[PDB]
Point group: D2
Chain length 316, copies 4
Amino acid sequence: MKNNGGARVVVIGAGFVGASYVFALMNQGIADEIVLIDANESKAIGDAMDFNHGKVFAPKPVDIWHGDYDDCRDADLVVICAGANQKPGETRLDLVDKNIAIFRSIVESVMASGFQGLFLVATNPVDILTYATWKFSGLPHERVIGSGTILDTARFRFLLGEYFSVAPQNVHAYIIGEHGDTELPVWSQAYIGVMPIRKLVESKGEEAQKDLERIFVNVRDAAYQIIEKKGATYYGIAMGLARVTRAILHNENAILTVSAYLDGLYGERDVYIGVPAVINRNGIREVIEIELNDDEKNRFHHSAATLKSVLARAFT
Amino acid sequence: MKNNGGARVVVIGAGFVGASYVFALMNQGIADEIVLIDANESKAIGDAMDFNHGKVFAPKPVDIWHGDYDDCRDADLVVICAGANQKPGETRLDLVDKNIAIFRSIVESVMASGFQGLFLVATNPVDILTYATWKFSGLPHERVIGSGTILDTARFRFLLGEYFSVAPQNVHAYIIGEHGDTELPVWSQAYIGVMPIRKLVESKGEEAQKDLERIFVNVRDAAYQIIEKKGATYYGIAMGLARVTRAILHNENAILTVSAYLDGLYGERDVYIGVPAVINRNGIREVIEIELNDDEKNRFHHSAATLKSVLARAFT
Amino acid sequence: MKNNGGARVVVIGAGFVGASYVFALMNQGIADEIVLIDANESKAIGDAMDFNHGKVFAPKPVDIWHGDYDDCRDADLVVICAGANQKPGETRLDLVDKNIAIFRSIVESVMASGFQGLFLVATNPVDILTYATWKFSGLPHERVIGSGTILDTARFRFLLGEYFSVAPQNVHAYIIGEHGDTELPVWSQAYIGVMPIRKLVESKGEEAQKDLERIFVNVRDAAYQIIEKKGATYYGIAMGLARVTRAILHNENAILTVSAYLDGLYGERDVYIGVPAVINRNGIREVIEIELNDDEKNRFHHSAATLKSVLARAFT
Amino acid sequence: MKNNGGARVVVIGAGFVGASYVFALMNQGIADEIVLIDANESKAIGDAMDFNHGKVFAPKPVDIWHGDYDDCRDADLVVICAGANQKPGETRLDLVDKNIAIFRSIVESVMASGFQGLFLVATNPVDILTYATWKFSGLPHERVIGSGTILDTARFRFLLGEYFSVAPQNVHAYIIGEHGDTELPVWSQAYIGVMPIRKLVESKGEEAQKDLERIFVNVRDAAYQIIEKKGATYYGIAMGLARVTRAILHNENAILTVSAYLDGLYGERDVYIGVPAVINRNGIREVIEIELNDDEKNRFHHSAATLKSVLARAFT
Ligand SMILES: NC(=O)c1ccc[n+]([C@@H]2O[C@H](COP(=O)([O-])OP(=O)(O)OC[C@H]3O[C@@H](n4cnc5c(N)ncnc54)[C@H](O)[C@@H]3O)[C@@H](O)[C@H]2O)c1
Ligand SMILES: NC(=O)c1ccc[n+]([C@@H]2O[C@H](COP(=O)([O-])OP(=O)(O)OC[C@H]3O[C@@H](n4cnc5c(N)ncnc54)[C@H](O)[C@@H]3O)[C@@H](O)[C@H]2O)c1
Ligand SMILES: NC(=O)c1ccc[n+]([C@@H]2O[C@H](COP(=O)([O-])OP(=O)(O)OC[C@H]3O[C@@H](n4cnc5c(N)ncnc54)[C@H](O)[C@@H]3O)[C@@H](O)[C@H]2O)c1
Ligand SMILES: NC(=O)c1ccc[n+]([C@@H]2O[C@H](COP(=O)([O-])OP(=O)(O)OC[C@H]3O[C@@H](n4cnc5c(N)ncnc54)[C@H](O)[C@@H]3O)[C@@H](O)[C@H]2O)c1
Ligand SMILES: O=P(O)(O)OC[C@H]1O[C@](O)(COP(=O)(O)O)[C@@H](O)[C@@H]1O
Ligand SMILES: O=P(O)(O)OC[C@H]1O[C@](O)(COP(=O)(O)O)[C@@H](O)[C@@H]1O
């Protein structure tokens, strides 16, 4: 129901990421009901109108309306996009003090609501803030999901889809670790088809080679390059979130590189970090523990350590 | 062709209306090729990147990129969403001399591209600018479509879908004439299902009555209300642009309330104005001359009386 | 859930009508789980299989299987496309005896399954069996829905769209009453947009009149010409089915002309017949009482009369 | 254009597969114009109307009709589905002389249209009949595509997707060689994510081992479990055909395992067979030569060895 008995998705923090997220769902026709909750009520309000006015044309009927935390109680997924945005220069981590703060309230209000579905966090630092969402709430880590490396993984696929002129969609590779600076390309297990990548290049020596490194860097700095170009990013994320949201509402068991919490799986513990996980109706079915090279073993590990410390000194 | 062979939609003015628009094409999966052209290349470039990052998740494989007017030589439709934005407070039509000027260039360049597809105009005041576009392009008018009243109707429908509690989609009423303050709601020909509106409300005077004029006023007011709440309308128009587009791209013979040129049809000539028209792969097949009551017969000629002014005066 | 948590549709009779309707849900990505119960094992098996091998190409993850009646406890929809079909020569009603027999067990076998969702019937004669299905089910009549004249209406707009060269989707006309030879065209409430049909032809020559008239005959007789060419009809109906399926599963508030039960609504009572009705997540919200003309009230009434007699003469 | 201006696909042989295909495309929203040509018009006249009756509820406007060869002159794509179906006990190869004979005409007749698009061959033996169309068409072999191992592959991924409990859309494996008995699963290069199959099963040796070979057999034999349960297969092959069709029509640069010409690539020349290949607006871009263990190579050669004997004797 669009009228309380359907797929109700609640968006907390309706700015660029937020609202784009909503426009993608509407266009895509993914949820039944969509609630917008934002501090800037007005924003929540015009936006809502704005969506409803174009609805005569969406592919599927959906119920959009501006709400409150009580709308939570009944929603299936609480997607969080409120908070501070990295300005030019700043990293992801320069926000932790800022956001964790906001999360204490947000998360408290939705729990108080009587809520009980899953949580989809998108705010940066996505690995820091999903752990906190997991904490501040007390639900199983299995129902607190962060975008993680879904935006980064898709950029990879895009760039490599372009290098070899094949559908991104037929490009098989991941970026894991912190959705940020310590992220890493899992070259060791990257494929174009079923044909490994680090083997179609072995024929074009120290070109393929430099070329490949080049992509990764573009990958890794995407945000900064786009932040610099138009101030904030959000279409890349909107699609990423819209994609995760259907694995769930459609109980898909789609492998997705998202922010999963580990406790020994990658030889790391008590950290939320981007890793392959099977997503379904009930949140994370399980984290996939892919075979890494010593090289990867090492930077993944370097990344896990990085987050680790932030958490260390960053709780509440 | 994703590579110089299919539906090439070229967007000029990658600001809000523009990009939101491109966003919809992308999720609905409507064009094969999408090119962006904005005076502000930076903008246009972080948008093309931001777009592309999400497409491994897009419904349909699309080709988005930042181009230039030569990318027009090959396009089926060029949508204009560039130009100056009416600001808060109260200013629509005050965007004329302003916009006329900008049109003067864009057209030239595009026409210079060696373009021969359709123009889709969205800048304000949409009707004025449609004329200009047509004038400056010198393509037959049946190939210069304006968005005119396509948003104002989505809204009547939505508002009445709601009063009446039916899919907006089952609400059949129109808004024509100026896409601005002289617009009029065609009550004489407004249905719910196949049942006259003023007959459904028949039974409940100066109640349902007053509720009918209250809906319409919020129709007319819509932009000024959103603009004050979130500063600029853009999701509703994008869903709007998106619709027409499929009319064209799919040889649909859809009936939309667009900006069409008159030559005697509503007792008016030399005026691009909002009026139901059969759209299809070759532009407007014809203007549909509904019948109006004396009253609506009056507002219409009135609205038209108004636009003709502006043109009389801000052409030359 | 493809996994016991989604929208589940049980299909009883995987014949032409049955299986084609399943093929629709799947290419449209409409339900999460699709159960097929056919009195013919192999077949039901043959198809679940054949369905399955293609879904990798399906637009939406969908779980399809060959089930049984326990399957019905958790389904949201039970669609019945089982039993005997008219032969060249036969009419809808010659099937009554043959088929009421089959709904007793089926209707029983599901009610005992612990079933508590909505029924959508399509076996012919579609209005006798919608009545039989509500009775034998002892559910509120608003939860037992028959396809009725959805297909009839569909061929009208198709045809009317073609004559006037407008999108099927732009012709607004109904085919009410019986889903057989007594059905009638509400020519009094038909529009091409907001333009009364009998007023576009009001201008014409070589009987737009005659032509209009000829359409309906074509509508009326369509099964018969189609049966005579390819042996049975199933694609039209597969599309009406999936349409309703949508109104329901999406809590849509869609006005459809389905086989609904009247309790004094068209001056008729205790009968299942084609009439416009708002459809949503809880069965039928209400029957719409369009205003008929004297000729139409007349044929409506004679249609209802033909039905009651069979109800009256062939109850189980 | 729904009106001589878009992507026109022609279906020669509106049988089970021919017709299902059209059902796949219409629901999915892929062509603009679909022409049906059958030895037996009636069949064709029957489907056409059946189809048209339901189009008011198709997602996108499409135009169906029963035409003829001239409708091929303007055709983007000519999909051949006409000819004799393998009977139970009968092999793919007992059909050859039957089906060659028919292709000489059909082929010759479309050419003569002034046909100049691409050919997608479905009729069995697919590798043999695709070669035949190329032979008979005199067009460059990049324009004569057979469906070869696309279903065989739709099948392997669905079965493993189940064995492992991941979305089939997430199993990366192929079936190559003759669409028939000599086909082979490319085990040496199959993943479930980014992780090697014979690595996941590594841990439960000779259980995972046996499981995996059953699957394979189920795949190999699937044609016949179905021929025997329900008499003809047509739902998988139709989703498979729909998929190619979009690869082309969207100039997607997709990698599918199709029947393609070998001119050295797997150390085989002058044979048409199931091999991965990039597909776009111009048909086949290239054959993809993946890496094979000795075993795969051997069978693959062996398979080739077989097509090659049939052809030697099969010319017309
Ligand atoms: N993880 C990803 O891949 C990713 C990608 C892009 C952007 N982002 C994240 O998105 C976040 C902000 O995104 P943005 O650019 O859309 O910013 P934005 O300003 O557009 O949106 C933030 C919104 O949150 C609302 N908000 C603030 N405090 C609130 C509170 N206490 N309760 C409810 N709502 C509140 C504000 O009203 C504002 O509208 C950043 O943290 C950024 O890191 C994440
Ligand atoms: N037609 C409708 O119903 C409707 C609805 C809403 C808004 N609008 C109209 O949309 C128009 C623009 O919309 P917006 O709010 O997104 O404004 P915006 O400022 O955000 O975007 C307009 C863009 O045009 C660009 N531009 C200006 N001159 C250009 C040129 N010569 N070449 C290329 N790019 C150029 C600017 O850089 C800017 O990016 C306004 O004129 C507004 O009135 C129309
Ligand atoms: N309502 C409409 O517009 C409409 C349109 C077209 C056709 N039809 C109706 O659909 C009905 C059948 O259509 P069809 O062409 O698919 O017939 P069909 O023979 O091809 O299919 C009927 C199926 O029912 C199965 N069946 C028989 N007894 C059963 C039982 N007890 N439980 C489960 N399955 C059982 C058969 O084995 C077969 O699979 C006919 O009444 C026909 O009049 C209705
Ligand atoms: N490649 C695949 O994976 C695949 C899968 C399944 C079935 N099939 C192939 O499909 C073929 C037939 O399929 P079906 O089950 O739908 O058969 P069918 O008998 O239902 O359809 C075949 C059609 O061919 C028509 N036809 C015959 N000669 C013709 C001619 N000269 N010109 C035009 N039309 C002509 C017939 O009248 C009939 O309409 C078989 O040969 C089989 O090998 C292929
Ligand atoms: O590359 P293949 O094996 O042909 O498979 C393509 C399928 O894989 C996907 O790209 C998913 O890939 P990932 O496993 O990398 O998530 C789908 O989008 C697509 O349908
Ligand atoms: O003629 P209009 O007002 O543009 O109406 C089109 C709308 O009507 C519909 O065709 C439904 O029509 P009905 O009201 O006749 O059921 C929708 O599918 C479509 O969005």
